[PDB]
Amino acid sequence: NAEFVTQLACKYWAPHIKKKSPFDIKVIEDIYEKEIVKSRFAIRKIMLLEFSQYLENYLWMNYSPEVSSKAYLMSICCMVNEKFRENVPAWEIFKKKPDHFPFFFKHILKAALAETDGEFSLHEQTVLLLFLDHCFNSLEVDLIRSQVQQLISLPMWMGLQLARLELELKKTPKLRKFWNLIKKNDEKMDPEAREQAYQERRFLSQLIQKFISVLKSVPLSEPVTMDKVHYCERFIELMIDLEALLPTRRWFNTILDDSHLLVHCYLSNLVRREEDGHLFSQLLDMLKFYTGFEINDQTGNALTENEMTTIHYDRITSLQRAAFAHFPELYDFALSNVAEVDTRESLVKFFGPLSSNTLHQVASYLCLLPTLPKNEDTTFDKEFLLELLVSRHERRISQIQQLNQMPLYPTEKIIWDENIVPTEYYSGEGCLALPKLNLQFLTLHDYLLRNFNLFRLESTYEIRQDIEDSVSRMKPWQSEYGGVVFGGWARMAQPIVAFTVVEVAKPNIGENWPTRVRADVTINLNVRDHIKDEWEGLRKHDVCFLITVRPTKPYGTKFDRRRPFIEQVGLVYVRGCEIQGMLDDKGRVIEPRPNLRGESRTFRVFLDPNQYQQDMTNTIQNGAEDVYETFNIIMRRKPKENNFKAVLETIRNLMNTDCVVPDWLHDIILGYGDPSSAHYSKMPNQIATLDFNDTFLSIEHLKASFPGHNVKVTVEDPALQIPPFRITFPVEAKTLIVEPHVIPNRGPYPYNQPKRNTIQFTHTQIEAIRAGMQPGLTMVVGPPGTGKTDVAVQIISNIYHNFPEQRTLIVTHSNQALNQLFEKIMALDIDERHLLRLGHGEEELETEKDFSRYGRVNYVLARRIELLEEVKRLQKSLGVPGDASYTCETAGYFFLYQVMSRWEEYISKVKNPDVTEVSTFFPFHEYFANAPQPIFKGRSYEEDMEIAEGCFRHIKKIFTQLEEFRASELLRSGLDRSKYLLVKEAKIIAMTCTHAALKRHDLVKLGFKYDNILMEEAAQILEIETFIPLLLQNPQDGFSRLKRWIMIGDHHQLPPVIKNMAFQKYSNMEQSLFTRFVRVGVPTVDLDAQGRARASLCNLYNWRYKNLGNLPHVQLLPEFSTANAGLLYDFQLINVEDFQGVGESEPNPYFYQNLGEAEYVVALFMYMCLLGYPADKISILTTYNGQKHLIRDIINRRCGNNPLIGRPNKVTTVDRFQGQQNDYILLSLVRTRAVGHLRDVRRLVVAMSRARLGLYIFARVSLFQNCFELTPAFSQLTARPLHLHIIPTEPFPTTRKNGERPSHEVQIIKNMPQMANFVYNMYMHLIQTTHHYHQ
């Protein structure tokens, strides 16, 4: 009935249909019963409804109390849930018309609590659970928060057992007055508002009771309906989210404990079902982590180890009090020391023999259960009563100890578990046992652990793929007797020839695992030399996997990749390892690498010590076979895709340090508290006066840079009002005091005057630069081409000059951004000896100078030589004898003894007074003879004195550098020399976030220090990889040394790449820290003037940003108003219908293509080349890799060996063209059936902004027009014709302007075949009339 739902849409609510039939309630009733319910809530049906804008255009705007029904409530929830599943904005229509939302919300609550199997089915109530989960996860929306407040505030405690309430009020006496105040205010309520309030206050506690009864209805072994299982799963998901968010946890945690839900769940039949309850069990483990989480519910602070111990000791103590006073059977227990009774074992020993009635009575004295009336039997099971008391009082290991016992490698028990390692096929219909990233975290441990686990589990997916491919290729077959033979070979995996554990070291004190486990693994490189080289290319810290297969198939049996991998190859074990090094023929671990002989190679590796202990324990205790005698395959990976273990290790070490981040950052990082509290205007150490140096080009530029301020200059003469400028900021209060000042003379060589900034920064860019110079958090949102890089280097330059004792860390996502920063840095007044760039390569040098450790060591060495030669020349100019050359050491002696002495004597004469005596007594005439003469001008004392001063500064700089360079005389190796630059010499240190994550351990060990962090591409960087650069150093006197945090990025462009999008769908793992901070509400500086593309093209994406306009040169330069030759419009959206009955096609699954679009795009590219376009100035983009390869295929098969037709600079996907651009972009959107991942507006914005001068898009226009999120772009694109307007008699280039009517014929191409015809005829006319000649 796809034609049914669509016809309804067209009639009643579809977009781009002028007139619709009026609202009819029966449409909602019919669609819900016959389309949604009858199809068993089929996802495709729900998608069609959601995409057709059912919620926005029919459901909500026609919703009222008078028309509300079951079908109406459910339909709204289905649409909202689907929007979450599709990651599109879910709440906008409610925000638009909020009036009836409170009524709607209250009735969702009623429906959720409705009697099981009653009016609402269990599935329908699961849908409601999920919807409510989304609500609780969305308290940032005022409309939702105002409804949810009453469900989760202190008054909810009226759902507590009366004795437990009193216990809590006694525990926190200050709570009682607030409790009383609530009871008083309740009196002022009318009877219905009171009843509504009480129902809301009891909702969650009553919901728990409903769950418990559903859970109990699950049989132990008999068949169970999946609807019960899924209800229970979604319920625990709700519990976790409520518990993992402080505002929802604060009062509800006590409620959850009072209900004893967790004990019910662990004793339940459902968890005991190994297959059915597996997901439920994993969700349960997550909930347990949070119900026992180490945080104070009221203060929100993390609990110390002492506080934990006290809590545990107080519980035992109160149990012993009750034991002593009321239970003779527990006399011995009550008198015993805590340690002797508080283990699970001891507690079972003491309470296990007791009757059900006695245990119930014990629990009642702890306010855990109601009193058991005299002579009554308890209704609770003994195992419940026992587990209640035992679990509550047993010793717990801390969160840290729990973390420190986790293996860092996935085993075969994890890699194929799709509850925690979902495939890319994950629809989003079921839930996963995964952490979620949103806005807030409980504590730093919570924050770090969520990222740890998400990184861990996501990386495991890629490992699965690598294992399945390489091991399948090896074709493991059975041989005789019962052995394995490999029918194939693999590049990335080899048969193990030998394996031996060679070291099991003793545990550190306390820890129960070996500190180190090592093994030797031998392979036989009976392979192609290319493969032999790659295997010998393994290096220290490279991670490999050790695999055990016991093949199931006879020899020759075909493998099917579609079938379950484990049964296919007989997968038994997977263990990870880390290369220490390859052995040489002297038995030494290789760190002048040798040429080994033969084809056998042995590697010494590290095994995960926690995994080793667990396996050994399993072997010793349970007779399990020794896993480490069974490995027969070893697999290596691509190094660039294989950093997971090192990142996890870094994150775990962080969790084991005190994590000292700035106190003004901690709360914001965790996502709570005032988001603006780290803004410079609110920092207590805000600096009043700043030197802006070369930031402003003139006093006019400065005045224009502060629109809302009154500028007062300390000097009236307009000729003295030139840069550099100091600016003092107040604390009338809109007044800026500007002081012009003079750069100190640097010597008699005018070329040694400093380089200067040439960028006339806008007032907005100035706000960013100003903020970056101040202490605190500075966030800059920089739309495409708004000058992010110029802002960055100006901030860096200003910090460099203002605070010469501070060090700046630069972190980016890509090496391209680093290349751009260093390029612009080179044009500014920054000494290259203070620059350093870290990286793992073997990276192509793209800048004019080399800023790697290697390049910088070399510069220092070469500069030292030149400077020591200057000292020699100085020596001789002074008439000091001595033929020996200087070292940095003797140069230092020379400066103090020969230079400073002469200068001090000189200053004593002329600065303690004629113009003539400035020059007459100047001690360095001969040294500066080579400089432009005369040195002194003889005009005034002040002038010549400063000229003399500058000469001394020149000489002093020589010796300052040599003193810095002495280290290269004390450190011979390039590695030690590079260490000196990193720890001491450099003032600006740059690297990628990737490198920062890998190298944090080494950096901390080196004593790396820095004061300021600047980041670019911030919204492209994963959350945890944004956090790690905050901690590349040790704390200083107990506090973070970090003074500034500047982040520059664009959350309206593409996010960090998540290989497996299931982790985005469920967990929002792609969300950057930058993006989270913007969402949290951290104030941002939004750059508002782009300078790389036409204003006309900018309109296609500037709607997405705050006030994004264009820079003057874009508005005024001819190059932006000159039309594109042979094309009427500078941009067009071109409709492409079917070609030979096909639209989108899929030759391989998910390898989306569109022959009609591809052929049209290539034909246009050919058309342009035949017009004389620079083929290199054209790049071709598409949203799918399948189409990319197809366009390439057609490029080679249609252009081929054509002299008149070049190649486009690139043929690639939009996602691979981030930060890149060309003059002309040809874009293919491919899809005809469904919109696909272009619905992500960020992908849209990137796609709309890759072109400087020309953008031509080929798509099924109708499909994308219907997409609500894409409307602001496509409503602009459809304002122009959807048939390509060509002007084939106008060659490239043209002087025709953008607006003027063309002086040639305009022909309209109405489809691709007509175009492919035209281009063929045009070319056959050009082959006859011309002849070009490349060979």
Ligand X SMILES: Nc1ncnc2c1ncn2[C@@H]1O[C@H](COP(=O)(O)OP(=O)(O)NP(=O)(O)O)[C@@H](O)[C@H]1O
Spatial distance between the Cα atoms of 131 and 77, rounded to a whole number of angstroms: 6
Confirm or deny that 401 is annotated as ligand binding: no
Nearer residue to ligand X within complex by CB, 632 or 798: 798
CB proximity list for 481: less than 8 A, separation 6 or greater:
none
Nearer residue to ligand X within complex by CB, 161 or 1099: 1099
Confirm or deny that 1218 is annotated as ligand binding: no
Confirm or deny that 788 is annotated as ligand binding: yes
Residue 62: which of 1, 20, 34, 3 has the closest Cα? 20
In the list ligand X, Mg ion, none, the entry touching 142 (Cβ below 5 to 8 angstroms by class) is Mg ion
CB proximity list for 18: less than 8 A, separation 6 or greater:
none
Query: Coil, strand, or helix at residue 676?
Result: coil
Nearer residue to ligand X within complex by CB, 670 or 796: 796
Nearer residue to ligand X within complex by CB, 759 or 900: 759
Nearer residue to ligand X within complex by CB, 320 or 789: 789
Least CB distance from residue 1165 to ligand X, whole Å?
A: 24
Least CB distance from residue 763 to ligand X, whole Å?
A: 10
In the list ligand X, Mg ion, none, the entry touching 776 (Cβ below 5 to 8 angstroms by class) is none
Give the CA distances from residue 1326 to residues 1163, 1204, 1207, in Å, rounded to whole numbers and listed in that order.
15, 9, 18
Please identify which residue in 393, 645, 864, 1092 interacts with ligand X, judged by CB under 6 A. 1092
Confirm or deny that 760 is annotated as ligand binding: yes
Instruction: Please tell me whether residue 1240 binds ligand X under the rule CB under 6 A.
Output: no
Q: What number of other Cβ atoms are within 10 A of residue 507's Cβ?
A: 14
Which strand (E) or helix (H) includes residue 725? Answer: strand 725-728
Confirm or deny that 285 is annotated as ligand binding: no
Instruction: Please tell me whether residue 814 binds ligand X under the rule CB under 6 A.
Output: no
Q: In the chain, which residues are last before a break of more than 2.5 Å from C to the next N?
A: 591, 731, 912
- Contact criterion met (CB below 8 Å) for 1278 and 1266: no
Least CB distance from residue 93 to ligand X, whole Å?
A: 33
Nearer residue to ligand X within complex by CB, 129 or 1089: 1089
DSSP annotation string for 291-341: HT-SB-TTT-PBPPHHHHHHHHHHHHHHHHHHHHHH-GGGHHHHHS-HHHH
Q: Which of residues 1107-1126 bind ligand X (CB under 6 A)?
A: 1111
Please identify which residue in 435, 1091, 1186, 1254 interacts with ligand X, judged by CB under 6 A. 1091
DSSP annotation string for 1162-1213: HHHHHHHHHHT--GGGEEEEES-HHHHHHHHHHIIIIISS-TT----S-EEE
In the list Mg ion, ligand X, none, the entry touching 609 (Cβ below 5 to 8 angstroms by class) is none
Q: Specify the stretch interacting with ligand X by CB under 6 A; choose among 231-239, 422-430, 550-558, 783-791.
A: 783-791
Least CB distance from residue 835 to ligand X, whole Å?
A: 19
Nearer residue to ligand X within complex by CB, 671 or 782: 782
CB proximity list for 139: less than 8 A, separation 6 or greater:
145, 148, 245, 247, 248
In the list ligand X, Mg ion, none, the entry touching 1091 (Cβ below 5 to 8 angstroms by class) is ligand X
Cis peptide before 1293 (omega within 30 of 0): yes
Spatial distance between the Cα atoms of 109 and 129, rounded to a whole number of angstroms: 10
Q: How many residues belong to the site for ligand X (CB under 6 A)?
A: 17
Confirm or deny that 1200 is annotated as ligand binding: no
Nearer residue to ligand X within complex by CB, 410 or 723: 723
Please identify which residue in 514, 609, 782, 1254 interacts with ligand X, judged by CB under 6 A. 782
Strand partners, 577: 544, 607
- Contact criterion met (CB below 8 Å) for 1126 and 1171: yes
Instruction: Please tell me whether residue 142 binds Mg ion under the rule CB under 5 A.
Output: yes
Spatial distance between the Cα atoms of 229 and 231, rounded to a whole number of angstroms: 5
Least CB distance from residue 1103 to ligand X, whole Å?
A: 17
Please identify which residue in 57, 282, 346, 786 interacts with ligand X, judged by CB under 6 A. 786
Please identify which residue in 784, 950, 1186, 1254 interacts with ligand X, judged by CB under 6 A. 784
Nearer residue to ligand X within complex by CB, 477 or 761: 761
CB proximity list for 1186: less than 8 A, separation 6 or greater:
1146, 1147, 1148, 1150, 1151, 1152, 1153, 1230
Confirm or deny that 254 is annotated as ligand binding: no
Which strand (E) or helix (H) includes residue 925? Answer: none
Binding mask 704-743 for ligand X (x = CB under 6 A): ----------------------------------------
Spatial distance between the Cα atoms of 547 and 558, rounded to a whole number of angstroms: 21
Binding mask 776-805 for Mg ion (x = CB under 5 A): -------------x----------------
Nearer residue to ligand X within complex by CB, 294 or 767: 767
Least CB distance from residue 1216 to ligand X, whole Å?
A: 14
In the list Mg ion, ligand X, none, the entry touching 784 (Cβ below 5 to 8 angstroms by class) is ligand X
Please identify which residue in 410, 785, 923, 1156 interacts with ligand X, judged by CB under 6 A. 785
- Contact criterion met (CB below 8 Å) for 1295 and 1276: no
Least CB distance from residue 1294 to ligand X, whole Å?
A: 24
Give the CA distances from residue 219 to residues 139, 261, 557, 701, in Å, rounded to whole numbers and listed in that order.
37, 18, 42, 78
- Contact criterion met (CB below 8 Å) for 1076 and 439: yes
Spatial distance between the Cα atoms of 522 and 329, rounded to a whole number of angstroms: 63
Least CB distance from residue 1252 to ligand X, whole Å?
A: 10
Nearer residue to ligand X within complex by CB, 1083 or 1091: 1091
Least CB distance from residue 705 to ligand X, whole Å?
A: 10
Q: What values do phi and psi take at 581, rounded to 5?
A: 175, 160
């007594």: which residue's tokens?
Answer: 921
Least CB distance from residue 493 to ligand X, whole Å?
A: 40
* Pair of tokens at residue 1319: 């281009």
Q: Which of residues 751-780 bind ligand X (CB under 6 A)?
A: 759-762, 765
In the list Mg ion, ligand X, none, the entry touching 1222 (Cβ below 5 to 8 angstroms by class) is none
Q: How many residues belong to the site for Mg ion (CB under 5 A)?
A: 3
Least CB distance from residue 242 to ligand X, whole Å?
A: 41
Nearer residue to ligand X within complex by CB, 775 or 1219: 1219
In the list Mg ion, ligand X, none, the entry touching 812 (Cβ below 5 to 8 angstroms by class) is none
Q: Specify the stretch interacting with Mg ion by CB under 5 A; choose among 137-145, 151-159, 308-316, 1302-1310.
A: 137-145
Nearer residue to ligand X within complex by CB, 784 or 1029: 784
Spatial distance between the Cα atoms of 212 and 1088, rounded to a whole number of angstroms: 55
Spatial distance between the Cα atoms of 808 and 144, rounded to a whole number of angstroms: 43
* Pair of tokens at residue 187: 């009196």
Confirm or deny that 790 is annotated as ligand binding: yes
Residue 646: which of 547, 576, 583 has the closest Cα? 576
Instruction: Please tell me whether residue 159 binds ligand X under the rule CB under 6 A.
Output: no
Strand partners, 837: 990
In the list ligand X, Mg ion, none, the entry touching 155 (Cβ below 5 to 8 angstroms by class) is none
Least CB distance from residue 59 to Mg ion, whole Å?
A: 20
Nearer residue to ligand X within complex by CB, 703 or 863: 703
DSSP annotation string for 336-374: S-HHHH-SHHHHHHHHTTS-HHHHHHHHHHTTSS----T
Q: What is the length of the chain? A: 1335
Interacting residues toward Mg ion by CB under 5 A: 141-142, 789
Interacting residues toward ligand X by CB under 6 A: 759-762, 765, 782, 784-790, 1091-1092, 1111, 1219
What residues are designated binding site?
760, 765, 785-790
What residues are designated binding site for ATP?
760, 765, 785-790
